[PDB]
Amino acid sequence: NTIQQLMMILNSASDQPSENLISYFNNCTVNPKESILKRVKDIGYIFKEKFAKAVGAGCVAIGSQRYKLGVRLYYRVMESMLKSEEERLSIQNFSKLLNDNIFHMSLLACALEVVMATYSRSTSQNLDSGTDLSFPWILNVLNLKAFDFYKVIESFIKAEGNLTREMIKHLERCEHRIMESLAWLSDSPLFDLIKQSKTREGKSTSLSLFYKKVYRLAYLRLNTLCERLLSEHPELEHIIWTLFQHTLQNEYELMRDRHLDQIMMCSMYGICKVKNIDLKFKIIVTAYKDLPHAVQETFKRVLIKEEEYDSIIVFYNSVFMQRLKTNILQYASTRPPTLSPIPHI
Amino acid sequence: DDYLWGLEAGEGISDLFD
């Protein structure tokens, strides 16, 4: 769809929300009109000033333009979603949704990420050096958490059918980044959601959905490393997958401030270790570099205890294995842990 | 593509925000 399509639509679009969007606002128990308009304006002084401080005053006009198109995208997708939702569950109100500041901050942030990313390289011009505001940047700007942001991505994508394949991919990668580390940082509401679940059952569709995507991503990466390093032993992987899967779910504190991939690599090693299969970390670490995520910092600088970081090998020996020693050994035991279902589709 | 469309049938964005 002409790589310029959506941006074309956006450039043509009006700055004020449509008669129909305003109509959704007027049918809410609590009118969100004023809040959404003010938020748009407030986040505007903030996005524009932070953006300008990223690229410079000579480029003030570009921040405004990024913002303008992002807000148009915001209203556009918002309206799209409300129609899909009205249709989905025939209701028409939506006060609960439209009055949720977090929802609105995530739609906006996601819309700003699209406009931002499509013009990335162009913005990267007149930028250069150690100031390349990739993705987490936009979250940093709106004081918005990665776990919240992630909640709008799949929906945002299904709501804007004119996203370039290039934009679709970027949004997808953003969600992957969240899943691999951003969502597990100590400032992440995910931990309040988890603890809530471990405690009082029921609720949180967002956590259930989060994990579904983590497991899928987790397995995919795991499977890639196995196809490369463990062709000789196919029975592994499923066993490695089980420890990996069991660990994220029941040993999630291991993930706090750490990386999905660190737990993955440590799962592979540990299981090969008890199953008497070579596999040095040196090997694992080398294949890992073949993964779309893969950066060296991830196995070179691993959180140990305090703000103390060390090699992934130190993490494995001092924390990982020490924390999971007995579980790992159960895999080589007479009654092996029931294998965990491989994530599908 | 590796992306996982996680929303089950009829789940929508409303089921993700309060």
CA distance A25 to A98: 8
| A316 in Cβ contact with A269 (< 8 Å) | yes
Using a CB-CB distance cutoff of 8 angstroms, which residues of chain A are in contact with residue B14?
85, 88-89, 94, 96-97
Beta bridge partners of residue A302, listed in sequence order: A310
At residue A146, φ and ψ (nearest 5 deg) are -55, -40
At residue A310, φ and ψ (nearest 5 deg) are -155, -175
Cα angle at A101 between A98 and A102, to 5 degrees? Answer: 110
E-only strand ranges, chain A: 302-303, 309-310
At residue A56, φ and ψ (nearest 5 deg) are 105, 160
CA distance A116 to A298: 27
| A131 in Cβ contact with A93 (< 8 Å) | no
Residue A310 DSSP one-character state: E
Tell me, yes or no, whether A225 and A266 share the same domain.
Answer: yes
Quickly count: other Cβ atoms within 10 Å of residue A124's Cβ. 13
In A, minimum Cα distance to B14 occurs at: A97
Tell me, yes or no, whether A9 and A145 share the same domain.
Answer: yes
**Which amino acid makes up residue A94?**
F
| A106 in Cβ contact with A144 (< 8 Å) | yes
**Listed residue (A189, A65, A37, A281) closest to B16, CA to CA:** A189
CB contact under 8 Å between B12 and A213, yes or no, is no
CA distance A203 to A287: 39
Final resolution, Å: 2.2
Residue listed under structure tokens 């209701």: A91
Beta bridge partners of residue A310, listed in sequence order: A302
B3 CA to centre of own chain:
12
Tell me, yes or no, whether A142 and A239 share the same domain.
Answer: no
Tell me, yes or no, whether A39 and A93 share the same domain.
Answer: yes
Residue A57 DSSP one-character state: G
* Helical ranges in A230-258 per DSSP H: 238-250
Task: Give Rg (Cα) of chain B.
Answer: 10
Q: Decide which of A184, A200, A234 is a domain's last residue.
A: A184
Beta bridge partners of residue A309, listed in sequence order: A303
Q: How many CA atoms lie within 13 A of A136 on its CB side?
A: 13
| A67 in Cβ contact with A41 (< 8 Å) | no
B15 touches chain A (CB under 8 A): yes
Task: Give Rg (Cα) of chain A.
Answer: 23
Q: Measuring CA to CA, how many Å separate A241 from each of A89, A117, A156?
A: 37, 34, 31
Tell me, yes or no, whether A200 and A307 share the same domain.
Answer: yes
Domain range enclosing A310: 185-345
B9 touches chain A (CB under 8 A): no
Closest-CA distance of chain B to residue A322, Å: 33
Which residues fall within 8 angstroms of residue A271, CB to CB, at 6 or more apart? A236, A239, A240, A243, A328, A331
* Helical ranges in A203-237 per DSSP H: 205-229
Total domains, chain A:
2
Which residues fall within 8 angstroms of residue A318, CB to CB, at 6 or more apart? A304, A305
For residue A213, give the 3-state DSSP assignment.
helix
